[PDB]
Amino acid sequence: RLRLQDIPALTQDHCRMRDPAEVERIINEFVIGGPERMQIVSDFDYTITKQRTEDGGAVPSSFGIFNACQSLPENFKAETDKLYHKYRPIEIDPHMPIAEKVQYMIEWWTKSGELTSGFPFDQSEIDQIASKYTHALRDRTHEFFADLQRLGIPTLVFSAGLGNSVVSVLRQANVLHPNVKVVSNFLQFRDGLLDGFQQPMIHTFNKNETVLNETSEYYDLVHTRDHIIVMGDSIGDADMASGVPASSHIMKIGFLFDHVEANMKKYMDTFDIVLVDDQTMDVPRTLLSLIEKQHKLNL
Ligand SMILES: C[n+]1cn([C@@H]2O[C@H](CO)[C@@H](O)[C@H]2O)c2nc(N)[nH]c(=O)c21
Ligand SMILES: [Mg+2]
């Protein structure tokens, strides 16, 4: 039986667990179950991309990648910057109830969509920008996605960001394998012009059962997958799989980098494993390797 003290990646100082015995139990369940029961649901911005780079270069968000493109109206990045100035403080307000935050985030994504309308746009601009950031993914991301593909594990990248940017980055990093799907806000085009974003709207606080559930198209791909790894860097990522009705065991992994001491309690109450300044996929990959080892024995 697997014991945490025998799993090196989980014994490191930066791996924090509120209840190590529960984490150990969940791991043993995933290993008993095999890869055929597993699915992954992961955030993109600052989960798949790094929170901290080695060379100190900045990493933009998926929206930032879009805003860096050259063929935007001269008005554009300034106007989105204004909207950011208004709504970002609200997004991170520590006192505001989630219901109020949700009203405001709906406003932000709506207005952002309305700005992103009325002019033509070539996806290749996005590709040119995204190409500069394929070197900014977490260490061993390539190996992680290769493991998932080899094991046939469905992997959903569930992002409140700009989907076209997410897809461009993953595709160019050679990790957008057939088992990987992206649910996000994609640019809508009509008669050759941008027309905002394709519904449904996905913002920071509805990445849950109200968007991803048993009526979703994606559900048919994963309805037999009751063991889930959920990965993200925000508290708002912890519910990404809440709409999967027959899940039996979920391991929630949170990457914590900003304001570590202030956020530590909340993160440890929300995630099963909290990874403090861990710019690698070595912990998720550890889980996959133990699942695969047993799969091989059973074969
Ligand atoms: C509509 N919106 C949300 N975010 C930000 O993207 C993050 C990742 O999903 C969100 O946390 C939010 O701060 C935006 N950023 C920019 N630059 N422009 C936007 O229109 C925008
Ligand atoms: Mg994120």
PDB file of C-alpha atoms and ligand atoms in Angstrom:
ATOM      1  CA  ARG A   1       0.000   0.000   0.000  1.00  0.00           C
ATOM      2  CA  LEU A   2       1.327   3.455  -0.782  1.00  0.00           C
ATOM      3  CA  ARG A   3       2.523   5.581   2.103  1.00  0.00           C
ATOM      4  CA  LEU A   4       3.264   9.255   1.665  1.00  0.00           C
ATOM      5  CA  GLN A   5       6.647   8.898   3.354  1.00  0.00           C
ATOM      6  CA  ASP A   6       7.572   6.635   0.432  1.00  0.00           C
ATOM      7  CA  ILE A   7       6.565   9.229  -2.173  1.00  0.00           C
ATOM      8  CA  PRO A   8       9.447  11.735  -2.477  1.00  0.00           C
ATOM      9  CA  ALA A   9       7.661  14.568  -4.294  1.00  0.00           C
ATOM     10  CA  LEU A  10       5.050  14.690  -1.550  1.00  0.00           C
ATOM     11  CA  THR A  11       7.571  14.876   1.301  1.00  0.00           C
ATOM     12  CA  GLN A  12       9.145  18.156   0.131  1.00  0.00           C
ATOM     13  CA  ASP A  13       8.913  21.322   2.272  1.00  0.00           C
ATOM     14  CA  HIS A  14       6.900  23.189  -0.380  1.00  0.00           C
ATOM     15  CA  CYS A  15       4.168  20.526  -0.464  1.00  0.00           C
ATOM     16  CA  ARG A  16       1.586  21.471   2.164  1.00  0.00           C
ATOM     17  CA  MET A  17      -1.314  19.218   3.134  1.00  0.00           C
ATOM     18  CA  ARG A  18      -4.034  19.888   5.711  1.00  0.00           C
ATOM     19  CA  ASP A  19      -4.758  16.155   6.009  1.00  0.00           C
ATOM     20  CA  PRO A  20      -1.925  13.971   4.657  1.00  0.00           C
ATOM     21  CA  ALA A  21      -3.814  10.769   5.619  1.00  0.00           C
ATOM     22  CA  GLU A  22      -6.707  11.769   3.347  1.00  0.00           C
ATOM     23  CA  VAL A  23      -4.339  12.600   0.497  1.00  0.00           C
ATOM     24  CA  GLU A  24      -2.725   9.186   1.003  1.00  0.00           C
ATOM     25  CA  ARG A  25      -6.120   7.472   0.848  1.00  0.00           C
ATOM     26  CA  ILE A  26      -7.096   9.312  -2.339  1.00  0.00           C
ATOM     27  CA  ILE A  27      -3.796   8.374  -4.006  1.00  0.00           C
ATOM     28  CA  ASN A  28      -4.341   4.727  -3.122  1.00  0.00           C
ATOM     29  CA  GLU A  29      -7.850   4.916  -4.637  1.00  0.00           C
ATOM     30  CA  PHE A  30      -6.511   6.372  -7.898  1.00  0.00           C
ATOM     31  CA  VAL A  31      -3.906   3.595  -8.022  1.00  0.00           C
ATOM     32  CA  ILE A  32      -6.477   0.816  -7.383  1.00  0.00           C
ATOM     33  CA  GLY A  33      -8.784   2.318 -10.014  1.00  0.00           C
ATOM     34  CA  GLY A  34      -6.283   2.579 -12.865  1.00  0.00           C
ATOM     35  CA  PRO A  35      -5.846   5.118 -15.667  1.00  0.00           C
ATOM     36  CA  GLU A  36      -9.188   4.150 -17.273  1.00  0.00           C
ATOM     37  CA  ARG A  37     -11.011   5.876 -14.371  1.00  0.00           C
ATOM     38  CA  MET A  38      -8.941   9.098 -14.329  1.00  0.00           C
ATOM     39  CA  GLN A  39      -9.509  12.560 -15.811  1.00  0.00           C
ATOM     40  CA  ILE A  40      -7.703  15.871 -15.350  1.00  0.00           C
ATOM     41  CA  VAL A  41      -9.279  19.309 -15.141  1.00  0.00           C
ATOM     42  CA  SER A  42      -6.723  22.133 -15.105  1.00  0.00           C
ATOM     43  CA  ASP A  43      -6.691  25.924 -15.187  1.00  0.00           C
ATOM     44  CA  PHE A  44      -4.376  27.523 -17.795  1.00  0.00           C
ATOM     45  CA  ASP A  45      -3.151  31.000 -16.756  1.00  0.00           C
ATOM     46  CA  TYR A  46      -0.478  30.692 -14.029  1.00  0.00           C
ATOM     47  CA  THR A  47      -1.188  26.957 -13.622  1.00  0.00           C
ATOM     48  CA  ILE A  48       0.107  25.656 -16.935  1.00  0.00           C
ATOM     49  CA  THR A  49       2.080  28.834 -17.451  1.00  0.00           C
ATOM     50  CA  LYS A  50       4.563  29.620 -14.713  1.00  0.00           C
ATOM     51  CA  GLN A  51       3.966  31.948 -11.778  1.00  0.00           C
ATOM     52  CA  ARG A  52       7.717  32.636 -11.697  1.00  0.00           C
ATOM     53  CA  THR A  53      10.264  32.331 -14.506  1.00  0.00           C
ATOM     54  CA  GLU A  54      13.972  31.570 -14.159  1.00  0.00           C
ATOM     55  CA  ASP A  55      15.121  34.561 -16.223  1.00  0.00           C
ATOM     56  CA  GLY A  56      12.664  36.958 -14.574  1.00  0.00           C
ATOM     57  CA  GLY A  57      10.736  37.642 -17.762  1.00  0.00           C
ATOM     58  CA  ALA A  58       7.054  38.487 -17.337  1.00  0.00           C
ATOM     59  CA  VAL A  59       4.405  35.982 -18.396  1.00  0.00           C
ATOM     60  CA  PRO A  60       1.206  37.511 -19.783  1.00  0.00           C
ATOM     61  CA  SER A  61      -2.246  36.059 -19.372  1.00  0.00           C
ATOM     62  CA  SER A  62      -4.181  34.623 -22.333  1.00  0.00           C
ATOM     63  CA  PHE A  63      -5.984  38.003 -22.558  1.00  0.00           C
ATOM     64  CA  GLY A  64      -2.598  39.768 -22.414  1.00  0.00           C
ATOM     65  CA  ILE A  65      -1.416  37.676 -25.342  1.00  0.00           C
ATOM     66  CA  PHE A  66      -4.410  38.891 -27.305  1.00  0.00           C
ATOM     67  CA  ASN A  67      -3.867  42.524 -26.286  1.00  0.00           C
ATOM     68  CA  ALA A  68      -0.241  42.383 -27.464  1.00  0.00           C
ATOM     69  CA  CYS A  69      -1.324  41.779 -31.093  1.00  0.00           C
ATOM     70  CA  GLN A  70      -0.473  44.428 -33.716  1.00  0.00           C
ATOM     71  CA  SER A  71      -3.672  44.786 -35.796  1.00  0.00           C
ATOM     72  CA  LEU A  72      -5.909  45.988 -32.967  1.00  0.00           C
ATOM     73  CA  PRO A  73      -7.559  49.411 -33.204  1.00  0.00           C
ATOM     74  CA  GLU A  74      -5.345  52.184 -31.752  1.00  0.00           C
ATOM     75  CA  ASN A  75      -8.055  52.611 -29.086  1.00  0.00           C
ATOM     76  CA  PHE A  76      -7.928  49.010 -27.922  1.00  0.00           C
ATOM     77  CA  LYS A  77      -5.362  48.127 -25.236  1.00  0.00           C
ATOM     78  CA  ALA A  78      -5.943  51.467 -23.542  1.00  0.00           C
ATOM     79  CA  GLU A  79      -9.693  50.732 -23.251  1.00  0.00           C
ATOM     80  CA  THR A  80      -9.180  47.183 -22.029  1.00  0.00           C
ATOM     81  CA  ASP A  81      -6.667  48.662 -19.556  1.00  0.00           C
ATOM     82  CA  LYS A  82      -9.387  50.946 -18.229  1.00  0.00           C
ATOM     83  CA  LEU A  83     -11.775  48.047 -17.788  1.00  0.00           C
ATOM     84  CA  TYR A  84      -8.996  46.115 -16.002  1.00  0.00           C
ATOM     85  CA  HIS A  85      -8.410  49.086 -13.706  1.00  0.00           C
ATOM     86  CA  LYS A  86     -12.087  49.091 -12.770  1.00  0.00           C
ATOM     87  CA  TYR A  87     -12.798  45.388 -12.357  1.00  0.00           C
ATOM     88  CA  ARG A  88      -9.558  43.731 -11.245  1.00  0.00           C
ATOM     89  CA  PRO A  89      -9.804  45.334  -7.747  1.00  0.00           C
ATOM     90  CA  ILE A  90     -13.308  43.888  -7.489  1.00  0.00           C
ATOM     91  CA  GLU A  91     -12.216  40.448  -8.671  1.00  0.00           C
ATOM     92  CA  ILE A  92      -9.706  40.211  -5.852  1.00  0.00           C
ATOM     93  CA  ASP A  93     -11.753  42.002  -3.127  1.00  0.00           C
ATOM     94  CA  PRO A  94     -11.397  39.869   0.012  1.00  0.00           C
ATOM     95  CA  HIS A  95     -14.625  41.092   1.646  1.00  0.00           C
ATOM     96  CA  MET A  96     -17.145  41.026  -1.216  1.00  0.00           C
ATOM     97  CA  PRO A  97     -19.583  38.089  -1.251  1.00  0.00           C
ATOM     98  CA  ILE A  98     -19.217  35.848  -4.275  1.00  0.00           C
ATOM     99  CA  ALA A  99     -22.733  36.715  -5.491  1.00  0.00           C
ATOM    100  CA  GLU A 100     -21.752  40.408  -5.776  1.00  0.00           C
ATOM    101  CA  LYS A 101     -18.412  39.599  -7.389  1.00  0.00           C
ATOM    102  CA  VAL A 102     -20.251  37.492  -9.950  1.00  0.00           C
ATOM    103  CA  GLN A 103     -22.439  40.478 -10.992  1.00  0.00           C
ATOM    104  CA  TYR A 104     -19.341  42.542 -11.524  1.00  0.00           C
ATOM    105  CA  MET A 105     -17.383  39.839 -13.427  1.00  0.00           C
ATOM    106  CA  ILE A 106     -20.348  39.401 -15.729  1.00  0.00           C
ATOM    107  CA  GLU A 107     -20.108  43.131 -16.423  1.00  0.00           C
ATOM    108  CA  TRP A 108     -16.345  42.902 -17.113  1.00  0.00           C
ATOM    109  CA  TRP A 109     -16.459  39.952 -19.514  1.00  0.00           C
ATOM    110  CA  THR A 110     -19.476  41.484 -21.282  1.00  0.00           C
ATOM    111  CA  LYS A 111     -17.792  44.830 -21.847  1.00  0.00           C
ATOM    112  CA  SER A 112     -14.522  43.164 -22.824  1.00  0.00           C
ATOM    113  CA  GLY A 113     -16.487  41.199 -25.440  1.00  0.00           C
ATOM    114  CA  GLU A 114     -18.174  44.353 -26.693  1.00  0.00           C
ATOM    115  CA  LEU A 115     -14.773  45.989 -27.200  1.00  0.00           C
ATOM    116  CA  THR A 116     -13.601  42.916 -29.074  1.00  0.00           C
ATOM    117  CA  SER A 117     -16.054  43.460 -31.916  1.00  0.00           C
ATOM    118  CA  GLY A 118     -16.379  45.242 -35.233  1.00  0.00           C
ATOM    119  CA  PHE A 119     -12.946  44.769 -36.857  1.00  0.00           C
ATOM    120  CA  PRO A 120     -11.333  41.811 -38.630  1.00  0.00           C
ATOM    121  CA  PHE A 121      -8.698  39.721 -36.869  1.00  0.00           C
ATOM    122  CA  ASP A 122      -6.254  37.085 -38.127  1.00  0.00           C
ATOM    123  CA  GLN A 123      -5.479  34.275 -35.620  1.00  0.00           C
ATOM    124  CA  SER A 124      -1.864  34.226 -36.871  1.00  0.00           C
ATOM    125  CA  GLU A 125      -1.195  37.439 -34.925  1.00  0.00           C
ATOM    126  CA  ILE A 126      -2.070  35.541 -31.787  1.00  0.00           C
ATOM    127  CA  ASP A 127       0.168  32.707 -32.913  1.00  0.00           C
ATOM    128  CA  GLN A 128       3.104  35.091 -33.363  1.00  0.00           C
ATOM    129  CA  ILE A 129       2.715  36.413 -29.833  1.00  0.00           C
ATOM    130  CA  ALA A 130       1.970  33.038 -28.209  1.00  0.00           C
ATOM    131  CA  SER A 131       5.106  31.557 -29.747  1.00  0.00           C
ATOM    132  CA  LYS A 132       7.239  33.693 -27.387  1.00  0.00           C
ATOM    133  CA  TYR A 133       5.724  31.960 -24.326  1.00  0.00           C
ATOM    134  CA  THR A 134       5.957  28.250 -25.109  1.00  0.00           C
ATOM    135  CA  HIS A 135       9.189  28.357 -23.056  1.00  0.00           C
ATOM    136  CA  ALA A 136       7.270  29.709 -20.043  1.00  0.00           C
ATOM    137  CA  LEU A 137       5.220  26.637 -19.138  1.00  0.00           C
ATOM    138  CA  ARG A 138       5.813  24.827 -15.852  1.00  0.00           C
ATOM    139  CA  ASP A 139       8.854  22.544 -15.916  1.00  0.00           C
ATOM    140  CA  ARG A 140       7.989  19.041 -17.212  1.00  0.00           C
ATOM    141  CA  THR A 141       4.674  20.227 -18.706  1.00  0.00           C
ATOM    142  CA  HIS A 142       5.630  18.433 -21.933  1.00  0.00           C
ATOM    143  CA  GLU A 143       6.255  15.213 -19.998  1.00  0.00           C
ATOM    144  CA  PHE A 144       2.987  15.601 -18.062  1.00  0.00           C
ATOM    145  CA  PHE A 145       0.886  15.971 -21.197  1.00  0.00           C
ATOM    146  CA  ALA A 146       2.790  13.095 -22.830  1.00  0.00           C
ATOM    147  CA  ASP A 147       1.933  10.878 -19.777  1.00  0.00           C
ATOM    148  CA  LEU A 148      -1.712  11.843 -20.101  1.00  0.00           C
ATOM    149  CA  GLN A 149      -1.761  11.030 -23.798  1.00  0.00           C
ATOM    150  CA  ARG A 150       0.046   7.701 -23.345  1.00  0.00           C
ATOM    151  CA  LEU A 151      -2.376   6.724 -20.564  1.00  0.00           C
ATOM    152  CA  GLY A 152      -5.402   7.830 -22.618  1.00  0.00           C
ATOM    153  CA  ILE A 153      -6.552  10.169 -19.828  1.00  0.00           C
ATOM    154  CA  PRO A 154      -8.980  12.925 -20.893  1.00  0.00           C
ATOM    155  CA  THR A 155      -7.592  16.300 -19.967  1.00  0.00           C
ATOM    156  CA  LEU A 156      -9.694  19.469 -19.899  1.00  0.00           C
ATOM    157  CA  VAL A 157      -8.078  22.869 -19.801  1.00  0.00           C
ATOM    158  CA  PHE A 158     -10.896  24.974 -18.267  1.00  0.00           C
ATOM    159  CA  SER A 159     -10.025  28.668 -18.487  1.00  0.00           C
ATOM    160  CA  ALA A 160     -11.868  31.960 -17.887  1.00  0.00           C
ATOM    161  CA  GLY A 161      -9.290  33.561 -20.184  1.00  0.00           C
ATOM    162  CA  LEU A 162      -9.131  34.060 -23.933  1.00  0.00           C
ATOM    163  CA  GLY A 163      -9.428  30.597 -25.489  1.00  0.00           C
ATOM    164  CA  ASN A 164      -7.716  31.397 -28.775  1.00  0.00           C
ATOM    165  CA  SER A 165      -4.550  32.330 -26.870  1.00  0.00           C
ATOM    166  CA  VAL A 166      -4.720  29.236 -24.669  1.00  0.00           C
ATOM    167  CA  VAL A 167      -5.038  26.962 -27.704  1.00  0.00           C
ATOM    168  CA  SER A 168      -2.232  28.770 -29.550  1.00  0.00           C
ATOM    169  CA  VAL A 169       0.170  28.368 -26.622  1.00  0.00           C
ATOM    170  CA  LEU A 170      -0.655  24.701 -26.056  1.00  0.00           C
ATOM    171  CA  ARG A 171      -0.508  23.830 -29.774  1.00  0.00           C
ATOM    172  CA  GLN A 172       2.805  25.526 -30.281  1.00  0.00           C
ATOM    173  CA  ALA A 173       4.267  23.882 -27.156  1.00  0.00           C
ATOM    174  CA  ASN A 174       3.321  20.537 -28.747  1.00  0.00           C
ATOM    175  CA  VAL A 175       1.042  19.488 -25.888  1.00  0.00           C
ATOM    176  CA  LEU A 176      -2.367  19.907 -27.539  1.00  0.00           C
ATOM    177  CA  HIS A 177      -2.838  16.133 -28.010  1.00  0.00           C
ATOM    178  CA  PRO A 178      -6.134  14.524 -29.091  1.00  0.00           C
ATOM    179  CA  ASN A 179      -7.048  13.743 -25.463  1.00  0.00           C
ATOM    180  CA  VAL A 180      -6.830  17.412 -24.519  1.00  0.00           C
ATOM    181  CA  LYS A 181      -9.820  19.745 -24.854  1.00  0.00           C
ATOM    182  CA  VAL A 182     -10.158  23.440 -24.040  1.00  0.00           C
ATOM    183  CA  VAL A 183     -13.260  25.074 -22.586  1.00  0.00           C
ATOM    184  CA  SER A 184     -12.853  28.853 -22.497  1.00  0.00           C
ATOM    185  CA  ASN A 185     -13.995  32.127 -24.076  1.00  0.00           C
ATOM    186  CA  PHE A 186     -13.383  31.886 -27.790  1.00  0.00           C
ATOM    187  CA  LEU A 187     -13.534  34.786 -30.257  1.00  0.00           C
ATOM    188  CA  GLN A 188     -16.715  34.844 -32.295  1.00  0.00           C
ATOM    189  CA  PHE A 189     -16.572  35.877 -35.959  1.00  0.00           C
ATOM    190  CA  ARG A 190     -19.419  37.020 -38.136  1.00  0.00           C
ATOM    191  CA  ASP A 191     -19.185  38.050 -41.763  1.00  0.00           C
ATOM    192  CA  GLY A 192     -15.444  38.431 -41.415  1.00  0.00           C
ATOM    193  CA  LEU A 193     -15.460  40.660 -38.311  1.00  0.00           C
ATOM    194  CA  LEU A 194     -15.009  39.998 -34.632  1.00  0.00           C
ATOM    195  CA  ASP A 195     -18.289  39.806 -32.741  1.00  0.00           C
ATOM    196  CA  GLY A 196     -17.312  39.390 -29.094  1.00  0.00           C
ATOM    197  CA  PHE A 197     -17.016  35.993 -27.474  1.00  0.00           C
ATOM    198  CA  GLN A 198     -18.882  32.754 -28.150  1.00  0.00           C
ATOM    199  CA  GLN A 199     -21.349  31.907 -25.390  1.00  0.00           C
ATOM    200  CA  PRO A 200     -21.270  30.682 -22.708  1.00  0.00           C
ATOM    201  CA  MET A 201     -19.350  33.300 -20.739  1.00  0.00           C
ATOM    202  CA  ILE A 202     -16.771  31.791 -18.419  1.00  0.00           C
ATOM    203  CA  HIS A 203     -15.440  34.134 -15.770  1.00  0.00           C
ATOM    204  CA  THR A 204     -13.366  33.695 -12.618  1.00  0.00           C
ATOM    205  CA  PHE A 205     -16.298  32.699 -10.466  1.00  0.00           C
ATOM    206  CA  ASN A 206     -18.429  30.368 -12.589  1.00  0.00           C
ATOM    207  CA  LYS A 207     -15.877  27.680 -13.440  1.00  0.00           C
ATOM    208  CA  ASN A 208     -18.161  25.083 -11.945  1.00  0.00           C
ATOM    209  CA  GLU A 209     -21.364  23.112 -12.332  1.00  0.00           C
ATOM    210  CA  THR A 210     -23.140  26.097 -13.927  1.00  0.00           C
ATOM    211  CA  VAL A 211     -20.858  25.760 -16.978  1.00  0.00           C
ATOM    212  CA  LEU A 212     -19.456  22.205 -16.884  1.00  0.00           C
ATOM    213  CA  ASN A 213     -22.036  19.583 -15.947  1.00  0.00           C
ATOM    214  CA  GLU A 214     -23.810  16.444 -17.147  1.00  0.00           C
ATOM    215  CA  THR A 215     -25.583  18.355 -19.953  1.00  0.00           C
ATOM    216  CA  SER A 216     -22.281  19.662 -21.324  1.00  0.00           C
ATOM    217  CA  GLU A 217     -20.877  18.349 -24.615  1.00  0.00           C
ATOM    218  CA  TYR A 218     -17.648  17.556 -22.813  1.00  0.00           C
ATOM    219  CA  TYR A 219     -19.498  15.270 -20.368  1.00  0.00           C
ATOM    220  CA  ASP A 220     -19.835  12.400 -22.843  1.00  0.00           C
ATOM    221  CA  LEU A 221     -16.045  12.173 -23.031  1.00  0.00           C
ATOM    222  CA  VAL A 222     -15.600  11.746 -19.270  1.00  0.00           C
ATOM    223  CA  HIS A 223     -18.788  10.272 -17.847  1.00  0.00           C
ATOM    224  CA  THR A 224     -16.948   7.003 -16.959  1.00  0.00           C
ATOM    225  CA  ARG A 225     -14.079   8.913 -15.304  1.00  0.00           C
ATOM    226  CA  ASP A 226     -14.890   9.123 -11.573  1.00  0.00           C
ATOM    227  CA  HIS A 227     -11.382   9.879 -10.343  1.00  0.00           C
ATOM    228  CA  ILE A 228     -10.384  13.481 -10.986  1.00  0.00           C
ATOM    229  CA  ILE A 229      -7.299  15.565 -10.528  1.00  0.00           C
ATOM    230  CA  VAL A 230      -8.153  19.280 -10.415  1.00  0.00           C
ATOM    231  CA  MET A 231      -5.307  21.771 -10.740  1.00  0.00           C
ATOM    232  CA  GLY A 232      -5.199  25.549 -10.440  1.00  0.00           C
ATOM    233  CA  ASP A 233      -3.626  28.633  -8.892  1.00  0.00           C
ATOM    234  CA  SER A 234      -6.815  30.413  -7.691  1.00  0.00           C
ATOM    235  CA  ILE A 235      -9.391  29.523  -5.035  1.00  0.00           C
ATOM    236  CA  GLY A 236     -11.955  29.885  -7.838  1.00  0.00           C
ATOM    237  CA  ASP A 237     -10.412  26.832  -9.548  1.00  0.00           C
ATOM    238  CA  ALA A 238     -11.184  24.363  -6.761  1.00  0.00           C
ATOM    239  CA  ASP A 239     -14.783  23.771  -7.990  1.00  0.00           C
ATOM    240  CA  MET A 240     -14.000  23.053 -11.612  1.00  0.00           C
ATOM    241  CA  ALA A 241     -15.217  19.466 -11.378  1.00  0.00           C
ATOM    242  CA  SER A 242     -18.233  20.046  -9.119  1.00  0.00           C
ATOM    243  CA  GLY A 243     -20.596  19.423 -12.027  1.00  0.00           C
ATOM    244  CA  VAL A 244     -19.412  15.816 -12.565  1.00  0.00           C
ATOM    245  CA  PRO A 245     -22.267  14.071 -10.722  1.00  0.00           C
ATOM    246  CA  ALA A 246     -20.817  10.592 -10.116  1.00  0.00           C
ATOM    247  CA  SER A 247     -17.277  11.476  -9.181  1.00  0.00           C
ATOM    248  CA  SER A 248     -16.023   9.377  -6.336  1.00  0.00           C
ATOM    249  CA  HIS A 249     -12.579  10.809  -5.539  1.00  0.00           C
ATOM    250  CA  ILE A 250     -11.131  14.212  -6.435  1.00  0.00           C
ATOM    251  CA  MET A 251      -7.643  15.451  -5.619  1.00  0.00           C
ATOM    252  CA  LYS A 252      -7.467  19.267  -5.669  1.00  0.00           C
ATOM    253  CA  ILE A 253      -3.976  20.677  -6.216  1.00  0.00           C
ATOM    254  CA  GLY A 254      -3.375  24.402  -5.725  1.00  0.00           C
ATOM    255  CA  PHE A 255      -0.311  26.324  -6.826  1.00  0.00           C
ATOM    256  CA  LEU A 256       0.263  29.162  -4.414  1.00  0.00           C
ATOM    257  CA  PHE A 257       2.747  31.939  -5.183  1.00  0.00           C
ATOM    258  CA  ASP A 258       1.339  35.382  -4.382  1.00  0.00           C
ATOM    259  CA  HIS A 259       1.105  36.507  -0.737  1.00  0.00           C
ATOM    260  CA  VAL A 260       1.884  33.053   0.614  1.00  0.00           C
ATOM    261  CA  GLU A 261       1.491  33.610   4.368  1.00  0.00           C
ATOM    262  CA  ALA A 262      -1.716  35.671   4.010  1.00  0.00           C
ATOM    263  CA  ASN A 263      -3.302  33.057   1.708  1.00  0.00           C
ATOM    264  CA  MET A 264      -1.935  29.879   3.293  1.00  0.00           C
ATOM    265  CA  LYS A 265      -4.917  29.105   5.547  1.00  0.00           C
ATOM    266  CA  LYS A 266      -7.529  29.591   2.796  1.00  0.00           C
ATOM    267  CA  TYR A 267      -5.540  27.596   0.272  1.00  0.00           C
ATOM    268  CA  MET A 268      -5.004  24.732   2.723  1.00  0.00           C
ATOM    269  CA  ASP A 269      -8.700  24.653   3.539  1.00  0.00           C
ATOM    270  CA  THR A 270      -9.615  24.623  -0.153  1.00  0.00           C
ATOM    271  CA  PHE A 271      -7.020  22.348  -1.802  1.00  0.00           C
ATOM    272  CA  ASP A 272      -5.906  18.881  -0.739  1.00  0.00           C
ATOM    273  CA  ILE A 273      -2.327  19.620  -1.754  1.00  0.00           C
ATOM    274  CA  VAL A 274      -0.931  23.158  -1.797  1.00  0.00           C
ATOM    275  CA  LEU A 275       2.318  23.698  -3.701  1.00  0.00           C
ATOM    276  CA  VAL A 276       4.208  26.777  -2.573  1.00  0.00           C
ATOM    277  CA  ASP A 277       6.355  28.330  -5.356  1.00  0.00           C
ATOM    278  CA  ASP A 278       6.571  25.059  -7.304  1.00  0.00           C
ATOM    279  CA  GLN A 279       7.125  25.958 -10.938  1.00  0.00           C
ATOM    280  CA  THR A 280       6.930  22.312 -12.095  1.00  0.00           C
ATOM    281  CA  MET A 281       4.388  19.610 -12.861  1.00  0.00           C
ATOM    282  CA  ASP A 282       6.407  17.124 -10.792  1.00  0.00           C
ATOM    283  CA  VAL A 283       3.641  16.489  -8.210  1.00  0.00           C
ATOM    284  CA  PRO A 284       0.829  15.763 -10.754  1.00  0.00           C
ATOM    285  CA  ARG A 285       3.317  13.648 -12.675  1.00  0.00           C
ATOM    286  CA  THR A 286       4.151  11.689  -9.515  1.00  0.00           C
ATOM    287  CA  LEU A 287       0.501  10.721  -9.165  1.00  0.00           C
ATOM    288  CA  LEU A 288       0.364   9.623 -12.788  1.00  0.00           C
ATOM    289  CA  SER A 289       3.528   7.528 -12.448  1.00  0.00           C
ATOM    290  CA  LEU A 290       2.134   5.553  -9.500  1.00  0.00           C
ATOM    291  CA  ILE A 291      -1.156   4.946 -11.337  1.00  0.00           C
ATOM    292  CA  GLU A 292       0.786   3.784 -14.430  1.00  0.00           C
ATOM    293  CA  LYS A 293       3.103   1.494 -12.417  1.00  0.00           C
ATOM    294  CA  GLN A 294       0.141  -0.438 -11.083  1.00  0.00           C
ATOM    295  CA  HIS A 295      -1.526  -0.454 -14.515  1.00  0.00           C
ATOM    296  CA  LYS A 296       1.574  -2.145 -15.883  1.00  0.00           C
ATOM    297  CA  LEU A 297       1.613  -4.762 -13.123  1.00  0.00           C
ATOM    298  CA  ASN A 298      -2.064  -5.596 -13.758  1.00  0.00           C
ATOM    299  CA  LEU A 299      -1.343  -6.076 -17.477  1.00  0.00           C
TER     300      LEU A 299
HETATM  301  C1  LIG B   1     -12.311  40.192 -19.165  1.00  0.00           C
HETATM  302  N1  LIG B   1     -10.926  40.066 -18.652  1.00  0.00           N
HETATM  303  C2  LIG B   1     -10.515  39.316 -17.615  1.00  0.00           C
HETATM  304  N2  LIG B   1      -9.192  39.445 -17.421  1.00  0.00           N
HETATM  305  C3  LIG B   1      -8.307  38.799 -16.436  1.00  0.00           C
HETATM  306  O1  LIG B   1      -7.900  37.540 -16.962  1.00  0.00           O
HETATM  307  C4  LIG B   1      -7.560  36.721 -15.857  1.00  0.00           C
HETATM  308  C5  LIG B   1      -7.392  35.259 -16.251  1.00  0.00           C
HETATM  309  O2  LIG B   1      -8.653  34.740 -16.612  1.00  0.00           O
HETATM  310  C6  LIG B   1      -8.680  37.009 -14.875  1.00  0.00           C
HETATM  311  O3  LIG B   1      -8.259  36.704 -13.551  1.00  0.00           O
HETATM  312  C7  LIG B   1      -8.900  38.501 -15.071  1.00  0.00           C
HETATM  313  O4  LIG B   1      -8.074  39.210 -14.160  1.00  0.00           O
HETATM  314  C8  LIG B   1      -8.703  40.260 -18.331  1.00  0.00           C
HETATM  315  N3  LIG B   1      -7.489  40.753 -18.632  1.00  0.00           N
HETATM  316  C9  LIG B   1      -7.342  41.618 -19.662  1.00  0.00           C
HETATM  317  N4  LIG B   1      -6.101  42.084 -19.922  1.00  0.00           N
HETATM  318  N5  LIG B   1      -8.370  42.023 -20.428  1.00  0.00           N
HETATM  319  C10 LIG B   1      -9.622  41.605 -20.237  1.00  0.00           C
HETATM  320  O5  LIG B   1     -10.548  41.993 -20.956  1.00  0.00           O
HETATM  321  C11 LIG B   1      -9.842  40.667 -19.124  1.00  0.00           C
HETATM  322 MG    MG B   2      -5.061  30.781 -13.230  1.00  0.00          MG
END
